[model samples]
Target: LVHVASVEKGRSYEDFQKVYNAIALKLREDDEYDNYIGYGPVLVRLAWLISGTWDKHDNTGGSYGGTYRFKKEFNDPSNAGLQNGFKFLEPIHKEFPWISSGDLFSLGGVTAVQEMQGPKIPWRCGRVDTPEDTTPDNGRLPDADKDAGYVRTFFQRLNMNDREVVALMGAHALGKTHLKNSGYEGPWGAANNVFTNEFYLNLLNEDWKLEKNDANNEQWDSKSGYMMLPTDYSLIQDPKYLSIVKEYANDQDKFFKDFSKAFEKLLENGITFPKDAPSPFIFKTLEEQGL
Candidate 1:
């Protein structure tokens, strides 16, 4: 869908700045979860799942509605363990009752990444929640059992190109695949809490073997017991995506730049941003602000 920048009525920069602070504060408090890896990756995944619902042609399901508050959206099998992320945001949602559900959910992701030491993702507002009937159909999320070609085609439905797909998947660096969540388990890098290009470096340098996990899922396993989904491994197997992976592994700055762009695009899917509207707000991470 096309972007049309929106103006926040009855709200100014300072108002949104306050909203940013609330999100940043909660991110720090929730850092204790997932083995102290923080709420970052799950938040990113939540945003991805929410926005991924958008169909390219019809634009029926997307970030615009924030329908995950309903059963049909949240109970989608692909969203298996994501209820934790939603529950984590419950208190924050109550406190910031004025913000729209779509804005709050997407902002949770933007805050999580920033607080976890990723780049500053500019967040915009003005998404109004829709009714339960508007919830997108299930099966929109990509399956972990899929391969490179399947992953590539699935992403196109979200309007993401090859480079964008590669960059977005780099987020796997910060979180582990839980068997309970996706039938896969193990972290991809050393610092699961911090956002970095370490995932690419580890993928290239580490000696990996194809193995079956307890769940019977096929993933590349390191001697240390870590794992990478086939889709994650596909980045290096495909030449087109491999170059980008190598580049990110070498340059931290490039990874941050491209990742920030693609992520914002993913979260803002189906929304139309116009020329007259104000640019997105880039709030400082809690760490950056010493909160």
Candidate 2:
């Protein structure tokens, strides 16, 4: 389970940059996807969910395998609505043809975050595709309808501490939960497609009312047309998570830096990069060159 980082033969930053450019170009052109919210958020979630499957002890699941392309992982109840992200990447895979599924999916997320005005997430490309039998079982993902304790303990499986948990949840700012999918509904903020520390701010500032969705499940509703899953609101309910949430809310630059580090760590779980492995590449966003 010790997945070594192996660069595609002769591939370097330039090859990956071209791959990133194609993904970014498609992101721009497909602006109408997902109700005009575009493909950004789901791509981020896609990468998270895929990588989130890892069990730190066994290393049974992770982005290193790229097994999310298989039916068992793809059909997980926890992964509902992510098919859109997979489809968004289909053409990119066809074009590149050599990038591993884990790399492409994770890079899709990195690309989405940057293209959507988020922090620069340094990435490495060496996740070789493993067979379908390696796909982890369902239910490894976290639950949306849970309290602070559940949220705290669940992320422990993924090896995330409290600060990392709060930092990673900042991604909630980028996407909406769907009643049809996660049995919850509503976006976390006004700028749902853009990455920000708004999730923390809103969690700290909003006067959220406990209300049940049509699915007979409760979600915290705000007057500003935003909503938070119980696990998200859990950050503020707990003292430790609340401290980090408050810190991140008050400091955007700090949040971005923490999130960038935490997110790269999240994706790199269960991966062992060799001493000779290429250094992580920081891809330039499409806007950086005005392309």
Candidate 3:
């Protein structure tokens, strides 16, 4: 399970920068996906799903292996609806044939976050793809049907603590859950395209009730036509996670900084960066570059 990154031959920052720009441009041009919310949310979710499979104890099923390209990992029940994100990346992969699948997938998320006006996530490129047999078995991802306790225990396999877990869940701010996809439906916040502390705000401010969707899955619903998985509601139900949620809802700057760190850590899990490996790249957004 110990896979080392075989850095793409002679690639430098500019090469990775080109790939980032391509993803950002498509994110802008592909505006009709998900009812005009675009590909940003699914890209972020794709990145998380790929990286989330890591079990720190054994270093199995991490983004470093890029096994999601295989049918077994691609069809993981937890990965339903993510094929859209993968399909979206297909053209980009074809255009930049030199980048490995793991790097492309992880970098797609970083590009989406930045282009959508989210925090600057420092990204590093060096994940090399491995074989299908290397893919970890399914069922490592968190279940949306469970509670706060389940959320806490689930992330432990990735070695995340309470604060890290809370910070990471903040990503739910970006996308909506489709009933056909995950048996849950609706966006977590008003600005689904733009990243913010909105998920925490919505959780604390909304008056929610336990209700079942057409799929008979119980999720918390609010009057604003928003929805939260039972797992999301667990944040507020648990005192420790609740406190962090309140803090993020109160401070946007803190939320952005913490989310950046936690996300970088999640993406880097199980990879051993050489001491001489270049510092993480803080990519310039298309807006920042005046594109």
Candidate 4:
């Protein structure tokens, strides 16, 4: 550990860890949101969606301030059902009132991903909260109704390349689309809660039926009863995207390594960490901390 000549005003590494504990504890307690399953998948999805709002040209929107707890941001149509992720974080924020909204929301995602057996996302502090009006408008997020062309055009605003886009969309494997939430339903793979290359595997192996859901919206469903958004299915249908999809499906380690790097970059989209800034800090979970 590096010794500081002066004391800081906000939380130290150890203190911030207690905040981590509070989040982990609630994640364990609030284990029955959809179908009595825990909130892990949605939380991971929340983090992804929030950060996905980044626009590289101006760097206007992103996870820098964690402003989604506010009504304007939380109520976005594209962000449907993410209010559940906000509700899940309420008690933890109350318990650790010292943490910034930006820090809490970003930390919630980091904790959820790691606990779900994904990578350990390194996070830094120092996100000052902005007003509700500062929250971004809708239409910044990717649409479930779109195709590979739309997906490519959408991610371009964020300055992501084809490879990065492929790695990022691999996250579709983590959670299901809620009919009430995204106007779609069903998990994308067999094991939704646990992180794996299963999404890629199912993407290749499953016999996908092109059909409309009960809502009359289009989605690809498997014989196993799993579903994929048109956008999700596009990864395999497009020749370029399909090659990357096959790579991830055939290699678990490649998927994790690419995904972890891409996800970390996505989370830090709008932030400016100084070159002299300290290294990214990883916190102990509640179970590990014995909180």
List RMSD in Å for every model shown.
1.8, 0.8, 0.8, 3.9
How well does candidate 3 match the true structure in TM-score terms? 0.98
- Candidate 4 local Cα displacement, residue 218, angstroms: 0.3
Minimal lDDT window, size 10, model 4: 1-10
lDDT winner between candidates 1 and 2: 2
Cα lDDT over the full model 2 = 0.92
lDDT of 3 at 128: 87
For 35-72, candidate 2 gives per-residue lDDT tens digits of 88999999999999999999989888989989999999
Tell me how far the alpha carbon of residue 60 in candidate 4 is from the true structure, in angstroms, after superposition.
1.1
Between candidates 1 and 4, the TM-score winner: 1
Q: What's model 2's TM-score?
A: 0.98
TM-score of each: 0.94, 0.98, 0.98, 0.92
Per-residue lDDT tens digits for candidate 4, residues 1-291, read: 111112125458887777777777777877777875588888888888788777787767787756676777777888888888888888888887877777777778888877777766787776666667767877688778889999899888877788889887877777788888778988888677677888888889999999998889999999898998998888987999999999999998888888877877778777777665666788776656566
Candidate 1 residue pairs that clash: 3-272, 3-273, 4-272, 4-273, 4-274, 5-273, 5-274
Task: Report the lDDT tens digits of candidate 3 across residue range 115-202.
Answer: 8888999998889888888988998988899888888888998889999998989999998999899888899989999999999999
- Of the two candidates 1 and 4, the one with more favorable lDDT, higher being better, is 1
Against the true structure, candidate 1 reaches a TM-score of 0.94
